[PDB]
């Protein structure tokens, strides 16, 4: 009991906060017309079925959005039909995995997190810190969206607004950055240094939500994101499998449920499945997710700048994590000063002319790319195929 | 000329800023009958005589403030009067310097340095960031003493406020340790790293101003500060002989200033002088003063929240400088982790039992006593004498 009750606690609540993020980003993108708790369904239902990994990830929230764009300007599609349109997606969408499945899933594991996982990672962090950005910037103007000529708006702009996003934002980026960092910090106690630490995120949420209350044809056309959604899921979902069954220590599944929550209203998330694994070295997502059914009444009870601080922060945390960013780093580093830099396991003595290092330049080529198209449509579409256009292709290609 | 142009460049503004600090200090603490400029004199006049030390620091504008405090109450002393109640609080200031001299200079090395003053430089620190935080108070409420009834007031308190002291204060706080930081920043370049490092301060000043504007009885009664100051100064001033002719490498002369600097409208600082002497191993005060001559039609043009992250960053600065601080941490450090601490070259092996370093909460015993003394009058007179009464004595009492 008290043994799998801690992996429960700490999973919850480190799942939680991103996916009631991503609820609201949901209520801001998507005009309020798919909620907060709408994306807590998404992972608790199916966290509660299961007969980590499974949650809702910032693709799903983006192609969500995609969808959005996809029917509200294309003339008659507009908005409440969304809803089910979302649904008869789900079909062709579940249909992908139905088809490719096991089958193709055998073959997913050589290519993927070896060279191109490195791309994926930066590009989430990438737009998810300028989605945090954005919500810096909801604070002010925004509320037309939310309402019309309120008493709110007028001076709780160029002022107000200061305190609302700038303080509470990157103050809870710092403090809680305390959860990553506390284990080592030197003037501490013990006993209780990881239960500041390991919830260190969840209790800023309450430190830092302390510190701010103190004051048809398209039917057809719909296979083209049930296609693309299938290759991306199987990146994502399967990476799940590639981190939990690590080298440290029902693949199909997922269609059978992508028709259920596309008719109602998820996927493997890259961060979470590994901290659920190494508790058993030193069954249990029905626990979370009912908690997470605790956390349908809780986004309620619960019931905010601090989040942009989230996106931001949870955009940041993917940093040190992530050797392509080290590369990207120590690509813009200086010359004289990357010899004191004595640590590096990731250069090594093989290749010891930083020319040899100099590719990283084609990865970040592409990478700008797919972010100088993932803010348009069309190409905002294709971002997975450029990945599997480019990336298994060049492997051959790279000496 | 370019060899002492570098460090008259660096140290005018590294010495303005405080200055500057204390001078609106002394706008706000003194009802503004203390301007910002008129602490610009008492160092410019004074560094362009000299035939670095000279400035004016923070005891300076302490007791200068319970000046105002001994006349502003009693009955009939109140104001305007104040600024020649100075001078002839100089003239026994000045007659006790001249007294004392360098017959009392002779003997001040042995005692202070070693033991006594890591309680100085930590009181300073302290009243510093305390007068930081209510810098951050006075961005909201206080503009009453500015002014009445005025359109800023109302709803720039608990709304525009936040930006104002907030964001500006720690902002300039966090970027602005990039000055102390910047010389082994892996990630640069070298040519210009100190151009970045040293002037970061400064630079900080311009940055985050960039980002703000983005938007008689009594006359024989007055030998007791002057007695009392006289044996603060004895340290400070002479602090600064002890430190700019440091083992790495006229003492009366201020008396005849303080009669001066008094009737009109300074001491040896304590961050500003080590920095001077170290550009001569591989005069010049005129220059720096000269510019600070400069900076007194440039506090004019120059032209505020970022003041107080100075004050709090100011009074940040001195903590790793001081082993007193290093020792009330590792005071109210845990057992377990300070094993791991392996560095620490204040502690040595002679006394490797931790409660040989058992004696420090003395020292802080002494400061607490202070510091709550320091906060009410009587006794925020009576605060160098309680230094006098108990630190020269205990050194035999000690083991």
């Not at 403090?175 to 006993?191: E, N, P």
Request: hydrophobic fraction near 55%.
């Amino acid at each position: 009991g008290f043994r799998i009750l801690a992996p429960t606690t700490y999973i919850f609540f480190a799942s939680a906060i991103p996916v009631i993020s991503f609820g609201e980003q949901l209520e801001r993108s998507t005009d309020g017309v798919l909620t907060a708790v709408q994306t807590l369904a998404s992972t608790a239902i199916c966290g509660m079925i299961h007969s980590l990994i499974l949650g809702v990830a910032e693709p799903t929230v983006i192609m969500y959005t995609f969808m959005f764009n996809f029917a509200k300007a294309r003339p008659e599609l507009g908005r409440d039909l969304f809803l089910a349109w979302s649904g008869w997606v789900c079909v062709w969408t579940a249909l992908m995995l139905f088809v490719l499945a096991i089958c193709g899933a055998c073959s997913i594991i050589n290519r993927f997190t070896r060279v191109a996982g490195e791309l994926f990672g930066l590009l989430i962090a990438m737009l998810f810190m300028q989605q945090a950005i954005k919500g810096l910037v909801d604070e002010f103007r925004i509320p037309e969206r939310e309402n019309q000529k309120l008493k709110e708006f007028l001076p709780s702009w160029r002022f107000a607004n200061g305190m609302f996003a700038l303080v509470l934002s990157f103050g809870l980026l710092l403090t809680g950055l305390r959860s990553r960092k506390a284990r080592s910090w030197r003037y501490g106690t013990g006993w209780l240094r990881s239960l500041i630490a390991d919830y260190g995120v969840p209790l800023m949420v309450l430190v830092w939500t302390g510190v701010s209350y103190i004051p048809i044809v398209y039917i057809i056309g719909a296979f083209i994101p049930a296609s693309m959604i299938a290759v991306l899921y199987y990146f994502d979902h399967s990476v799940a499998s590639q981190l939990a069954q690590q080298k440290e220590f029902d693949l199909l599944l997922l269609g059978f449920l992508t028709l259920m929550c596309g008719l109602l209203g998820s996927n493997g998330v890259i961060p979470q499945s590994p901290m659920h694994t190494k508790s058993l070295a030193t069954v249990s997502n029905l626990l979370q997710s009912t908690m997470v059914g605790g956390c349908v009444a809780a986004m309620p009870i619960l019931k905010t700048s601090v989040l942009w601080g989230y996106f931001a922060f949870m955009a940041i945390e993917s940093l040190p994590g992530n050797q392509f960013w080290e590369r990207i780093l120590l690509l813009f580093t200086a010359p004289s000063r990357r010899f004191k830099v004595l640590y590096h396991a990731t250069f090594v003595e093989t290749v010891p002319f930083k020319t040899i290092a100099m590719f990283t330049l084609f990865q970040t080529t592409y990478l700008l790319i797919c972010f100088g198209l993932t803010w348009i449509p069309i190409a905002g579409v294709m971002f997975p195929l450029m990945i599997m256009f480019l990336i298994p292709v060049r492997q051959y290609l790279l000496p």
